[PDB]
Amino acid sequence: SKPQPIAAANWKSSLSGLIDLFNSTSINHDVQCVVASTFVHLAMTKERLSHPKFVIAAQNAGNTDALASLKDFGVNWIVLGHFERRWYYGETNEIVADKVAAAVASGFMVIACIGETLQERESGRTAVVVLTQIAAIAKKLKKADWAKVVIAYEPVWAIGTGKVVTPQQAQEAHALIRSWVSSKIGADVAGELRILYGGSVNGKNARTLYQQRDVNGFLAGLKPEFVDIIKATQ
Numbered sequence: 001s002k003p004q005p006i007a008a009a010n011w012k013s014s015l016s017g018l019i020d021l022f023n024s025t026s027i028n029h030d031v032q033c034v035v036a037s038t039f040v041h042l043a044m045t046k047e048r049l050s051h052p053k054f055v056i057a058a059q060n061a062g063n064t065d066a067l068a069s070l071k072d073f074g075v076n077w078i079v080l081g082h083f084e085r086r087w088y089y090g091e092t093n094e095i096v097a098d099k100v101a102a103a104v105a106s107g108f109m110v111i112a113c114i115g116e117t118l119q120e121r122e123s124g125r126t127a128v129v130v131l132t133q134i135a136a137i138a139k140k141l142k143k144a145d146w147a148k149v150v151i152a153y154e155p156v157w158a159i160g161t162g163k164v165v166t167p168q169q170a171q172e173a174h175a176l177i178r179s180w181v182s183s184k185i186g187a188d189v190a191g192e193l194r195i196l197y198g199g200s201v202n203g204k205n206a207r208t209l210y211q212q213r214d215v216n217g218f219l220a221g222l223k224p225e226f227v228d229i230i231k232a233t234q
Contacts (some may be wrong), residue, residue, distance in 0.1 A: 001210060001211075001212070001213055001214075001215060001216060002191065003191070003192050003193070003194055003216060004030055004031065004032060004194070005030075005031045005032070005194065005210075005216050005217040005233040006031065006032045006033075006034060006111075006150060006194050006196055006216065006217040006218075007031055007032070007033045007034070007217050007218055007220070007226070007229055007230045007233055008033070008034035008035075008036060008057065008079070008111060008152070008196065008217070008218065008219045008220065009033075009034065009035055009036065009219075009220050009221060009222040009223075009226045009229075010036045010037075010059070010079060010082070010219060010220070010221060010222060011035065011036065011037045011038070011041060011221075011222035012038075012221065012222075015037075015041060015044060015045065015222075016044075016048070018222060018223070018224070019044075019045065019048045019049050021224060021227065022035075022049065022051055022054065022226075022227070023048075023049065023050060023051050025051070025227050025230070027051075027053050027230060028234075029233070029234050031053060031217070031230065031233045032053065032055070033051070033053050033054045033055070033230060034054070034055055034056070034057050034077055034111070035049060035054060035055075035056050035057065035222065036056075036057035036058065036059050036077070036078075036079045036111075036222075037056075037057075037058075037059065037222075038059055038060075039058070039059075042056065042058060042070075042073070042075060046073070046074065046075075055076065055077055056075050056077065057075070057077035057078055057079050057111065058070050058075050058077070058078045058079070059078070059079050059082070060080075060085065061078065061080075061099060061102070061103065064102055064106065067102060067103060067106040067108070068106065071106060071107055071108070076107065076108060076109055077108060077109045077110075077111070078103050078108050078109075078110055078111070079110075079111045079113070079152075079219070080096060080099050080100050080103065080110055080111065080112050080113065081096040081099075081100070081112045081113040081114060081133070081137075081152075082113045082152075082154070082198075082219075083113065083115060083154050083156045083159065086113075087117070087156065093132060093133050093136035093137075094136055096112070096133075096136065096137065097136040097137045097138075097139060097140040098140060100112050100137050100140065100141070100149070101140035101141055101145075104141065104145050104148045104149065108148065109148050109149075109150065110148060110149050110150065111150045111151075111152050111196070111219065112137055112149060112150065112151055112152065113151075113152040113153075113154050113198060113219070114130055114133040114134055114137075114151065114152070114153060114154070114177070115130065115133075115153055115154035115155055115156040115157075115198070116129040116130055116156060116157060117129075117156050117157055118156075118157040118161050118163065120157070121157040122157075126173070126176075127176055130153070130173065130176065130177065131176070131177075131180050134151070134177065134180060134181075135180075135184075138181075138184065138185065143185060143186060143189060146181075146185060146189045146192070146193065147192070149193070150193075150194045150195075150196065151177060151193060151194065151195045151196070152195070152196045152197075152198040152219040153170070153173050153174055153177060153195055153196070153197060153198055153199075154198035154199065154219070155169075155170070155173070155197075155198070155199040158199055158200070165199050167205070167208055167209045167211075167212055170197050170199065170209060170212065170215065171212040171213070171214055171215065174195045174197070174212070174214035174215055175213075175214045177195050177214075178190050178193070178195060178214050181193055193216075194216035194217060195214060195215065195216055196215075196216060196217045196218050196219045197209055197215055197217075197218055197219070198218070198219035198220070201218060201220060201229060202225055202228070203225055203227075203228025203229065203231070203232060206218065206228065206229045206232035207231075207232040209232070210232050210233055210234075217233055218232075218233075
């Protein structure tokens with residue numbers, strides 16, 4: 001928890017009132033807040049959201065013209081590799097790596113998601129899946145490019161499964177990720193990198209989760225409690 005933390009929120013499907021709430025939220029400490037949405041709702045979010053610590057993110061780019069369109073529309077952040085895209089639409093490690101590389105090359109700050117399934121965890125293959133995913137990403141980048149990159153660990157194994165995650169487990173995953181980047185990219189890059197927890201999280205357990213080293217913030221859902229999640233990054 002040393003570099004500047006990030007609190008990001010993903011609005012998947014009213015937004016009006018939530019933007020008001022955030023606009024009137026006071027934030028004493030340094031933290032980069034992010035609001036990701038789908039294309040349909042980028043517009044309302046750009047029109048309405050105005051909080052100094054907040055930027056807008058996109059969720060998906062089909063092609064490179066979409067990246068340029070977004071860039072033109074004044075959107076500089078994007079979220080990629082999120083589970084629904086890997087597991088629902090079969091975006092391979094390589095497809096994601098390319099999107100990330102494309103995004104970075106086009107001037108984006110990228111939040112790149114990784115995470116293993118329940119089968120994968122239960123079979124003991126957390127580290128190989130997670131590290132295989134991030135290795136794919138890295139393969140398409142240079143050391144300099146890591147300045148524009150954020151990692152979000154999604155505990156996919158705790159989605160639709162009734163399972164819950166302990167902070168020890170979240171820490172372990174983040175730690176492992178950090179270790180890889182340190183040893184394969186550089187300790188300096190690893191020190192600056194932000195790895196966010198993208199599992200379900202409320203105000204209460206978010207503070208305790210942020211207390212772990214190696215957790216640098218959250219990828220969460222856009223909801224009223226996001227306010228508490230932001231607060232939890234002191």
